[PDB]
Design a protein around this ligand. Structure first.
Ligand code: HEM
Length: 153
């Protein structure tokens, strides 16, 4: 939904995540939890984490980080042609995890926040703009799948 050039700017930045997905994933979930603490209530496994130092020690918080970024990268690499990868995610999140689209908006910002803190030199004005666009496309799609499931919010 981006130009071919935008998808390249996206994949070029993702490449940096791939050199260390668990650590980018850990920081992303920590960024999200400090930023929208309500977001932690959706995680049974994580409600007990009471500070960042606790978040940081959590080995599972970290595996979950890896899981989330791993599915997202599978999705970003389909440069748009992702329905098969999106569906099972819209299903589980829609119906079993109960995640409103607004939250997607929050993870989207933590992801950008982390690329921005981790890779400044490399996440310039062009790249920021293409990632945002790619992250918006993913949400808009997820939104639409929700709707089709007859869910919404
Ligand atoms: C970048 C967007 C996200 C991606 C790619 C992603 C990916 C995943 C994947 C691959 C799983 C395990 C498989 C599945 O259950 O479908 C999962 C589980 C889950 N996700 Fe997400 N997720 C995202 C955002 C969210 C957000 C924003 C929340 C909550 C605020 C969330 C809450 C959960 C929960 C509660 C689980 C179950 C955790 C467990 O294994 O106990 N997801 N997610």
């Amino acid at each position: 939904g981006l130009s071919d050039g935008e998808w390249q700017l996206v994949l070029n930045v993702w490449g940096k995540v791939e050199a260390d997905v668990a650590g980018h994933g850990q920081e992303v979930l920590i960024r999200l939890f400090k930023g929208h603490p309500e977001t932690l209530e959706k995680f049974d496994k994580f409600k007990h984490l009471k500070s960042e130092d606790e978040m940081k020690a959590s080995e599972d918080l970290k595996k979950h980080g890896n899981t989330t970024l791993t599915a997202l990268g599978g999705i970003l690499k389909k440069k748009g042609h992702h329905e098969a990868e999106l569906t099972p995610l819209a299903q589980s999140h829609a119906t079993k995890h109960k995640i409103p689209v607004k939250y997607l908006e929050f993870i989207s910002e933590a992801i950008i926040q982390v690329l921005q803190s981790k890779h400044p030199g490399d996440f310039g004005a062009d790249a920021q703009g293409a990632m945002s666009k790619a992250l918006e496309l993913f949400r808009n799609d997820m939104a639409a799948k929700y709707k089709e499931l007859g869910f919404q919010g």
